[PDB]
Amino acid sequence: SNAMLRRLFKKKYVCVRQYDLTDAGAACLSSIAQYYGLKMSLAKIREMTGTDTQGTNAYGLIHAAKQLGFSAKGVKASKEDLLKDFRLPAIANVIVDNRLAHFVVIYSIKNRIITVADPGKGIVRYSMDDFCSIWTGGLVLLEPGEAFQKG
């Protein structure tokens, strides 16, 4: 019996990187959407989030996430809080070129190495202090609410 279709590697690499700039929030959200098993295309996300190409805020970003099945919330945290609060993939408000508002997905943080999914370069490794230089206190916490079947 091979009734279980759990051998289908239909894009297990949910780390997406396509059309990166400042509206990256849509792209990084898509990575999470896929990771959480919702599987969403980046173009549709941008139309749901309403991601402004002028440096949008995560409040509209999370506005679509909540509708995708995972409760997302934008909050402020401290550098050391990155190590204790959220472990699961989350969206971080990160500033690039000290000007453009950007967003990345935290995948793993260990040994002061912060691994984020960047919609331009892909899986990139940022050092603890380096990440705290670009991350300006903008964290989005996510949790698989209706994305995770109960019972």
Coordinates of C-alpha atoms in Angstrom, one line a residue:
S1 CA 0.0 0.0 0.0
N2 CA 1.4 3.4 -1.1
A3 CA -1.6 5.5 -0.4
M4 CA 0.3 8.2 1.5
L5 CA 1.5 10.8 -0.9
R6 CA 4.2 12.1 1.5
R7 CA 7.0 11.2 -0.9
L8 CA 6.0 14.1 -3.2
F9 CA 8.8 16.6 -3.0
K10 CA 6.6 19.2 -4.7
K11 CA 8.7 22.2 -3.7
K12 CA 9.8 21.4 -0.1
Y13 CA 12.2 24.3 -0.5
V14 CA 9.7 26.9 0.6
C15 CA 12.5 29.5 0.8
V16 CA 11.3 31.7 -2.1
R17 CA 13.3 34.5 -3.7
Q18 CA 11.7 36.4 -6.5
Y19 CA 11.2 40.1 -7.2
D20 CA 13.0 41.6 -4.2
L21 CA 13.3 45.3 -3.5
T22 CA 11.3 47.0 -0.7
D23 CA 7.9 45.2 -1.2
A24 CA 9.9 42.1 -0.1
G25 CA 7.3 41.6 2.7
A26 CA 5.1 39.8 0.2
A27 CA 7.9 37.5 -0.9
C28 CA 9.1 36.6 2.6
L29 CA 5.5 36.1 3.7
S30 CA 5.0 33.6 0.8
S31 CA 7.9 31.6 2.2
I32 CA 6.2 31.3 5.5
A33 CA 2.8 30.6 3.9
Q34 CA 4.4 27.7 2.0
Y35 CA 6.3 26.5 5.1
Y36 CA 3.1 26.4 7.2
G37 CA 1.6 24.3 4.5
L38 CA -0.7 26.9 3.1
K39 CA 1.3 27.4 -0.1
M40 CA 0.7 30.8 -1.6
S41 CA 2.1 32.6 -4.6
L42 CA 4.1 35.8 -4.1
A43 CA 2.0 37.8 -6.5
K44 CA -1.2 37.0 -4.7
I45 CA 0.3 37.9 -1.3
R46 CA 1.3 41.4 -2.5
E47 CA -2.3 42.0 -3.5
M48 CA -3.6 40.7 -0.1
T49 CA -1.1 42.4 2.1
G50 CA -1.3 45.7 0.3
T51 CA 2.5 46.0 0.6
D52 CA 3.5 49.5 -0.3
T53 CA 6.5 49.9 -2.5
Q54 CA 7.3 53.0 -0.5
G55 CA 8.4 51.2 2.7
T56 CA 5.2 49.6 3.9
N57 CA 4.6 48.7 7.5
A58 CA 4.2 45.1 8.8
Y59 CA 0.7 46.0 10.1
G60 CA -0.7 45.5 6.6
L61 CA 1.6 42.6 6.0
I62 CA 0.2 40.7 9.0
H63 CA -3.3 41.8 7.9
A64 CA -3.0 39.2 5.1
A65 CA -1.2 36.6 7.2
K66 CA -4.1 36.4 9.6
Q67 CA -6.3 35.6 6.6
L68 CA -3.8 33.0 5.4
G69 CA -4.3 30.8 8.5
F70 CA -1.5 32.0 10.8
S71 CA -1.9 34.7 13.4
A72 CA 0.7 37.4 12.8
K73 CA 1.4 40.4 15.0
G74 CA 3.9 43.2 14.8
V75 CA 5.7 44.0 18.1
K76 CA 9.0 45.5 19.3
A77 CA 11.6 43.4 21.0
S78 CA 15.2 43.5 22.2
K79 CA 18.2 41.9 20.6
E80 CA 18.4 39.2 23.3
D81 CA 14.7 38.5 22.9
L82 CA 15.4 37.1 19.5
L83 CA 17.0 34.1 21.2
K84 CA 14.1 33.3 23.6
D85 CA 10.8 34.6 22.3
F86 CA 10.3 33.2 18.8
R87 CA 12.0 30.0 17.5
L88 CA 9.7 29.2 14.6
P89 CA 9.9 31.1 11.3
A90 CA 8.9 34.8 11.7
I91 CA 9.0 38.1 9.8
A92 CA 11.5 40.7 10.8
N93 CA 11.4 44.4 9.9
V94 CA 14.9 44.9 8.6
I95 CA 16.5 48.0 7.1
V96 CA 18.8 47.7 4.0
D97 CA 21.1 50.4 2.8
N98 CA 20.0 52.2 6.0
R99 CA 17.0 53.5 4.0
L100 CA 14.9 50.8 2.3
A101 CA 12.4 49.0 4.4
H102 CA 12.9 45.2 4.0
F103 CA 11.6 42.0 5.5
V104 CA 13.2 38.6 6.1
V105 CA 12.1 35.3 7.6
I106 CA 14.1 33.9 10.6
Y107 CA 14.7 30.2 10.1
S108 CA 17.1 29.4 12.8
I109 CA 19.2 31.2 15.5
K110 CA 22.2 29.4 17.0
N111 CA 25.8 30.1 18.1
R112 CA 25.0 33.8 17.6
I113 CA 24.3 33.0 13.9
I114 CA 21.0 34.3 12.7
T115 CA 19.8 32.5 9.6
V116 CA 17.2 34.3 7.7
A117 CA 15.4 33.7 4.4
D118 CA 16.1 36.7 2.2
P119 CA 13.9 37.0 -1.0
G120 CA 17.0 38.2 -2.9
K121 CA 19.9 36.1 -1.9
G122 CA 18.1 33.2 -0.3
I123 CA 19.3 31.5 2.9
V124 CA 21.8 34.0 4.3
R125 CA 23.7 33.9 7.6
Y126 CA 23.8 37.1 9.7
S127 CA 25.8 37.5 12.8
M128 CA 23.9 38.3 16.0
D129 CA 25.2 41.8 16.3
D130 CA 25.1 42.4 12.6
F131 CA 21.4 41.4 12.4
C132 CA 20.7 43.7 15.4
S133 CA 22.3 46.5 13.3
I134 CA 19.8 46.1 10.5
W135 CA 16.8 44.9 12.5
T136 CA 15.4 48.0 14.1
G137 CA 13.0 46.5 16.7
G138 CA 10.3 45.3 14.3
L139 CA 9.2 41.7 14.9
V140 CA 6.3 39.9 13.6
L141 CA 5.3 36.8 15.6
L142 CA 3.4 34.1 13.8
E143 CA 1.6 31.0 14.9
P144 CA -0.3 28.3 12.9
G145 CA -3.8 29.0 14.3
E146 CA -6.3 27.5 11.8
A147 CA -3.3 26.4 9.7
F148 CA -2.9 23.5 12.2
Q149 CA -5.7 21.0 12.4
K150 CA -6.7 20.4 16.0
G151 CA -8.1 17.3 17.8

